[PDB]
Amino acid sequence: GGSMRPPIIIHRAGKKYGFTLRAIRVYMGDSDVYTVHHMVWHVEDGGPASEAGLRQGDLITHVNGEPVHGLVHTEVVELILKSGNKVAISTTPLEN
């Protein structure tokens, strides 16, 4: 199921969306390869993202409907920025 979790439509606040994006990494239990994930580490209290429903410690699987599973921290950052006015952030639990 690709489309199941509702995206967090965050409104533009001048430039920032009111949250901190962090490219976390969990090493794979087999090789030396790692598993990089894009998770929001913090959401400003009363910020746009907070209003949109974005929480910290989730897992951003898609940005604007685009698969970001594999991109660099900046690719997704730009992606979000490129949205314009608002951005749909597909958030899902961070279970590991």
């Binding site: 901190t20 976390i24 990494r25 921290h73 979000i80």
Partner: peptide, 13 residues
């Protein structure tokens, strides 16, 4: 820790 600052990047958007 996965919450490190080493390889774990951080940037406010």
């Amino acid at each position: 820790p996965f919450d490190e600052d080493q390889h774990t990047q951080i940037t406010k958007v």
